[PDB]
Amino acid sequence: AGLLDGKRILVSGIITDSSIAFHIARVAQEQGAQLVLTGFDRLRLIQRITDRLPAKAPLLELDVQNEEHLASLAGRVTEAIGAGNKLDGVVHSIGFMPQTGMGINPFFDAPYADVSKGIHISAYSYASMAKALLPIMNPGGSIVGMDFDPSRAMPAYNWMTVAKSALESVNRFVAREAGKYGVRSNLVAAGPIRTLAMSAIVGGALGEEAGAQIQLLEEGWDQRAPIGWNMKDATPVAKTVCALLSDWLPATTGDIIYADGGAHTQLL
Amino acid sequence: AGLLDGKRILVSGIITDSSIAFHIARVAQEQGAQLVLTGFDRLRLIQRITDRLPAKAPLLELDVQNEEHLASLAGRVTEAIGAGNKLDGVVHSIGFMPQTGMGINPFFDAPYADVSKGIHISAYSYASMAKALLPIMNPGGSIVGMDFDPSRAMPAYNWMTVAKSALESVNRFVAREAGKYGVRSNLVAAGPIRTLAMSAIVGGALGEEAGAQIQLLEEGWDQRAPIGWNMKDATPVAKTVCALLSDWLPATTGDIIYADGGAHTQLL
Numbered sequence: 001a002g003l004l005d006g007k008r009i010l011v012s013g014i015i016t017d018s019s020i021a022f023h024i025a026r027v028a029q030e031q032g033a034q035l036v037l038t039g040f041d042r043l044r045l046i047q048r049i050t051d052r053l054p055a056k057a058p059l060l061e062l063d064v065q066n067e068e069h070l071a072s073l074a075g076r077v078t079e080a081i082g083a084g085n086k087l088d089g090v091v092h093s094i095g096f097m098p099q100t101g102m103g104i105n106p107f108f109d110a111p112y113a114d115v116s117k118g119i120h121i122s123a124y125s126y127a128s129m130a131k132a133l134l135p136i137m138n139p140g141g142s143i144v145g146m147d148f149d150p151s152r153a154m155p156a157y158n159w160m161t162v163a164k165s166a167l168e169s170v171n172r173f174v175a176r177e178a179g180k181y182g183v184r185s186n187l188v189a190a191g192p193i194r195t196l197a198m199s200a201i202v203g204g205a206l207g208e209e210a211g212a213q214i215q216l217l218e219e220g221w222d223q224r225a226p227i228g229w230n231m232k233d234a235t236p237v238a239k240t241v242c243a244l245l246s247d248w249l250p251a252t253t254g255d256i257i258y259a260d261g262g263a264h265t266q267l268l
Numbered sequence: 269a270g271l272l273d274g275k276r277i278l279v280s281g282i283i284t285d286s287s288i289a290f291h292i293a294r295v296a297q298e299q300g301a302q303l304v305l306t307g308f309d310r311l312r313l314i315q316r317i318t319d320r321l322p323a324k325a326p327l328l329e330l331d332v333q334n335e336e337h338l339a340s341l342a343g344r345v346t347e348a349i350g351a352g353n354k355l356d357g358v359v360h361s362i363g364f365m366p367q368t369g370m371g372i373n374p375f376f377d378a379p380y381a382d383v384s385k386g387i388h389i390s391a392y393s394y395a396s397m398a399k400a401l402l403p404i405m406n407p408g409g410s411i412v413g414m415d416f417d418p419s420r421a422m423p424a425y426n427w428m429t430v431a432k433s434a435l436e437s438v439n440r441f442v443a444r445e446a447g448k449y450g451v452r453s454n455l456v457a458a459g460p461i462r463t464l465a466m467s468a469i470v471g472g473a474l475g476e477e478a479g480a481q482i483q484l485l486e487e488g489w490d491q492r493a494p495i496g497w498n499m500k501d502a503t504p505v506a507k508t509v510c511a512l513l514s515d516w517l518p519a520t521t522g523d524i525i526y527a528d529g530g531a532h533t534q535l536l
């Protein structure tokens with residue numbers, strides 16, 4: 001087969017080989033997709049990493065907070081997939097929040113600026129990628145972003161939770177605009193995954209207490225999941241994003257798909 | 269009686285005599301509350317207006333985006349309610365979004381800056397008022413903000429809907445912090461009210477199309493409300509905020525109370 005046979009998907013947000021984008025990309029490729037990657041600030045590093053990928057892919061630099069990068073994106077993508085072709089899928093796997101809006105530092109103490117940097121990169125950027133790529137997408141195209149159920153407060157993820165609730169609200173508006181092009185836009189809500197970043201944190205980088213709390217959120221997750229939750233295998237999330245990028249979920253947009261072991265549907 | 273007998277509530281967000289804060293304030297007063305008001309930029313105007321209020325109240329200037337105003341707030345409030353006393357309620361009835369993130373101008377075209385100004389004043393400010401006043405609140409105190417169900421996209425309210433979803437997420441975090449002081453924090457989701465601002469808009473200030481859309485959202489509202497919805501009487505919203513400020517809803521925080529005629533519970 002190739003669930004994504006002959007499709008053209010752009011993928012963003014690869015840093016290390018434990019980035020969730022990294023896995024989405026790998027599975028996408030085993031699934032016949034043909035990619036184009038974007039990276040942020042360590043390009044040679046992302047470059048080196050991305051080679052272990054099952055197959056080659058052009059890599060474009062893109063700082064989601066950069067006007068030009070954005071203005072030039074579609075141009076650059078077409079040079080690479082080559083003129084005459086369009087995108088079938090776009091993945092927004094990116095996000096960020098200053099240390100101050102998140103860890104240990106109390107909720108009221110994060111200054112708006114940091115918080116705004118956060119919302120800029122984490123939520124607003126979904127809109128900007130859309131606006132930039134939509135003109136080059138085929139109908140039936142699919143835009144997907146990564147979420148973390150912000151629907152109930154929790155410790156430590158402070159303002160980042162605020163930025164995900166804002167992201168979920170942007171998705172519904174992006175869905176309205178994308179539909180005029182025949183394109184879907186949805187999010188995926190993942191359970192906690194031991195990414196590099198997370199590791200450092202349960203490892204005590206945002207402070208001891210923050211770490212202990214995450215660590216506990218993490219264990220509550222697998223207890224509650226009727227099918228369990230393994231924080232060290234991003235696989236089950238990759239596959240979902242893949243399902244969404246394909247043609248099998250054709251009537252769903254401005255929506256959230258929970259890839260979290262069923263944890264959110266159980267109280268305890 | 270005096271539902272709010274001998275309570276001390278601070279009230280913000282009065283501009284004209286059609287501001288929702290204006291009514292909350294009036295009903296609060298008929299209910300025995302003793303207020304302190306904050307105003308923004310037209311102080312003499314707010315001053316003049318506030319005199320028609322059923323009773324006198326000190327007015328303090330406060331631009332929610334001003335570090336000092338904020339640092340000095342509690343000082344100023346105590347000078348006025350007078351040393352030895354504390355606040356029992358605080359009302360956040362304020363909000364704003366640049367013309368560019370809202371009306372007619374397409375969703376993707378609002379620049380982050382305007383959008384950020386919006387989120388600053390509209391959502392983040394709930395956190396900052398909290399942080400500023402909590403140290404002076406009595407236990408059993410109640411903080412309340414005004415919401416507009418952002419839970420499903422709609423036309424024209426573009427980024428302002430995004431800012432309300434972010435507000436609802438902040439409320440849950442403010443609720444976590446307030447509880448350590450014995451204080452509740454909730455929001456109120458109102459139906460559309462013919463405030464000055466709104467008028468101008470259904471009147472075609474944000475463009476014709478924006479106006480026509482609101483106008484229709486407005487009429488869908490009363491059809492759906494099993495008990496109807498009158499956009500020209502803010503009364504039923506005042507009363508609710510009042511219920512929340514009192515002691516009759518003592519076990520509810522980080523929550524949303526719908527004061528919207530029951531519209532949100534019906535499909536059509």
Ligand SMILES: NC(=O)c1ccc[n+]([C@@H]2O[C@H](COP(=O)([O-])OP(=O)(O)OC[C@H]3O[C@@H](n4cnc5c(N)ncnc54)[C@H](O)[C@@H]3O)[C@@H](O)[C@H]2O)c1
Pocket residue numbers: 012013014015016018019020021039040041062063064065093094095096121146147148189190191192193194195196197198
């Ligand atoms: N790890 C989790 O437990 C978890 C759970 C659910 C959802 N998510 C989301 O998955 C997404 C990917 O996170 P990850 O956990 O794989 O982390 P990750 O740290 O590997 O990747 C996040 C990406 O954001 C990029 N970034 C920061 N600023 C940027 C900018 N200006 N322009 C472009 N890229 C920028 C980084 O290069 C990085 O590739 C995030 O949105 C995260 O919120 C993660």
Ligand SMILES: NC(=O)c1ccc[n+]([C@@H]2O[C@H](COP(=O)([O-])OP(=O)(O)OC[C@H]3O[C@@H](n4cnc5c(N)ncnc54)[C@H](O)[C@@H]3O)[C@@H](O)[C@H]2O)c1
Pocket residue numbers: 280281282283284286287288289307308309330331332333361362363364389414415416457458459460461462463464465466
């Ligand atoms: N009118 C509606 O149909 C409707 C519906 C539901 C919820 N709400 C909310 O009710 C709240 C009050 O709105 P209103 O409709 O009564 O409008 P209004 O325009 O009379 O008042 C909003 C207030 O925001 C203040 N403002 C702007 N920037 C400020 C700043 N930097 N510092 C302090 N104040 C600032 C203004 O002075 C004004 O008093 C808003 O949050 C609005 O979103 C309104």
